[PDB]
UniProtKB/Swiss-Prot annotation, chain A:
Effect of residue 90 to R: In strain: Beta/B.1.351
Consequence of changing residue 205 to V: In strain: Zeta/P.2
Reaction(s) catalysed by this chain's protein: TSAVLQ-|-SGFRK-NH2 and SGVTFQ-|-GKFKK the two peptides corresponding to the two self-cleavage sites of the SARS 3C-like proteinase are the two most reactive peptide substrates. The enzyme exhibits a strong preference for substrates containing Gln at P1 position and Leu at P2 position
Listed name of the protein: 3C-like proteinase nsp5
Lineage: Viruses, Riboviria, Orthornavirae, Pisuviricota, Pisoniviricetes
Residue ranges constituting the Peptidase C30 domain according to the UniProt record: 1-306
Annotated effect of mutating residue 142 to A: Does not affect ability to cleave and inactivate human TRMT1
Assembly and oligomerization: 3CL-PRO exists as monomer and homodimer. Only the homodimer shows catalytic activity. Interacts with host FBXO22; this interaction promotes the proteasomal degradation of nsp5.
Outcome following mutation: residue 189 to A: Does not affect ability to cleave and inactivate human TRMT1
Coiled coil (residue ranges): none
Active-site feature positions: 41, 145
Reported effect, residue 49 to A: Does not affect ability to cleave and inactivate human TRMT1
Covalent cross-link site, Glycyl lysine isopeptide (Lys-Gly) (interchain with G-Cter in ubiquitin): 5, 90
Topological domain ranges for the Cytoplasmic compartment: 1-306
Length: 306, 305
């Protein structure tokens, strides 16, 4: 039993991290097979920050303007190309530590692990979610660009995020491993701001189901709600609307606990109205929204504590 | 910027985990050099666990009674012995992925990373604190025994914890890697309860410093206090006493922020007496106590391995 923010074991990703330097700029790259992936903004100088013409800057680079270092080894770059906002450096050696891997673009609400790195070396691992406003609430310092987000479902590493920048409110933005930004952001230093963020309702509901599995019952009630009435209330607290898709996703947790999804929705409406009254749920005095239905089933027993 | 509960990268430990089976029991072992470490309770039947005589159970066993699997490879056990509540299985092959390591016993208040494992496969990593009552608040299912906890210093892994059991309240108890329990626990199926727990004051202060570094400042005030005055308040709230060593350890953060420890102590006094008055700190409505001063400096400085 117990319930914790849990990251994937980072080892398979650790063996892929390298350092990339171009000019005076050093950041992280991801070395899979014979390609190193990194943010294309590595090729910018100071006057290129507002309105870089990436095609123009890249054509001006030779292979030997890129210093790539894997531990103590220099890897020789033998080719370069750009894909959207990611740079792809061809090197003369395939990474012998390359895991089984794939690239996946995720949707808001999904969770993943981040391996934060500086100078091609891992600093730490933690769990994040893609926020509804397409940002992530990370922990990143200068030098952390090129750090990646990943899942490991069943021996294969699914890469879903690469870190590019910090926005003015202190939240983070980046791309998939095909170089497409999450959300409306661009790799320019022009003024940009995240939209107002909301709470990931389906994830909160999942976490309430986790609480019940771990033996909490204090927040349950005898009421139910229509889906529509729930949404009208929830939106007044800056909660995301719950779709029928979301209702379906919670069906297994519903069945394992014997509490219907709209039954649980009524608990959540009550909690938003009353607060916790000095109590906690699973070690929090807030409603947690960074655990998916899938995370909860994976982390929990298949036996409820009644 | 930003601040998260962050584990050490687990790769160096992932390469050390194996599966150990004795009779019908499978759990995890730690393979370092030519020895596999695991909980001694692996050898017990259900009946045994009520009142075990480990000495007697162990002499009765031989090498071939222990099945050690590292992925698809069977290790040959060539010897066995017990040290406290840990079993040591000598194997015919040194682990070629053995990292630079040592065995270290930690103190209550200190944090570490747990690599939760099942059937010898790493499953998840998370950061824990050793509670004042010597439990950890972990996340463990059946098959997790023998999972380990550790810190990293440069390239050196310090192993500090091996998971043995769950207590009735859902908290967890285990040993150091020399088999000595943390806390007043024994490895048998009998009635055991954790003592009443306390809050780790120096860690709360470190977290308030992390909040300030990240621009979260509402709880700061013009006041200061004395160790004596604070401790009298704190002890009233089941907060551990703040020692002078604790104050010295916070010195780096006090200097980096311009909030002196006793200045920050005055803020924490008010939070205890008054609550958070509807606010949050670093996205929490509780006072978090599972980050050490060292944790905060490391995370906010960007130390690497
Ligand atoms: O439908 C999903 N995301 C998009 C929604 C969430 C906020 C508004 O739009 N599902 C995610 C949660 C479960 C795993 C992925
Ligand atoms: Cl997704």
């Amino acid at each position: 039993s117990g319930f914790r923010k849990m990251a994937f074991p980072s080892g398979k990703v650790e063996g892929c991290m390298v350092q990339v330097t171009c000019g005076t700029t050093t950041l992280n790259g991801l070395w899979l097979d014979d390609v190193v992936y990194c943010p294309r903004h590595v090729i910018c100088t100071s006057e290129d920050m507002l309105n870089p013409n990436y095609e123009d800057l890249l054509i001006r680079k030779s292979n030997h303007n890129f210093l790539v270092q894997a531990g103590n080894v220099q890897l020789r770059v033998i080719g370069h190309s750009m894909q959207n906002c990611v740079l792809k450096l061809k090197v003369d050696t395939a990474n012998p530590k390359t895991p089984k891997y794939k690239f996946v673009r995720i949707q808001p609400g999904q969770t993943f692990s981040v391996l934060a790195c500086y100078n091609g070396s891992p600093s730490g691992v933690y769990q994040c979610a893609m926020r509804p406003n397409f940002t992530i609430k990370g922990s990143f310092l200068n030098g952390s660009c090129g750090s990646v987000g990943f899942n490991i479902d069943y021996d294969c590493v699914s890469f879903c995020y690469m870190h590019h920048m910090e926005l003015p409110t202190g939240v983070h933005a980046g791309t998939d491993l095909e170089g497409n930004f999450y959300g409306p952001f661009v790799d320019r230093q022009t003024a940009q701001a995240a939209g107002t963020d909301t709470t990931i309702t389906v994830n909160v509901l999942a976490w309430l189901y986790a609480a019940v599995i771990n033996g909490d019952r204090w927040f349950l009630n005898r009421f139910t709600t229509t889906l529509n009435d729930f949404n009208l209330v929830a939106m007044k607290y800056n909660y995301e609307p719950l779709t029928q898709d979301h209702v379906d996703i919670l069906g297994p947790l519903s069945a394992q606990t014997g509490i219907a999804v709209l039954d649980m929705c009524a608990s959540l409406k009550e909690l938003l109205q009353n607060g916790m009254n000095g109590r906690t749920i699973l070690g929090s005095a807030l409603l947690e929204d960074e655990f998916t239905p899938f995370d909860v089933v994976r982390q929990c027993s298949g036996v409820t504590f009644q």
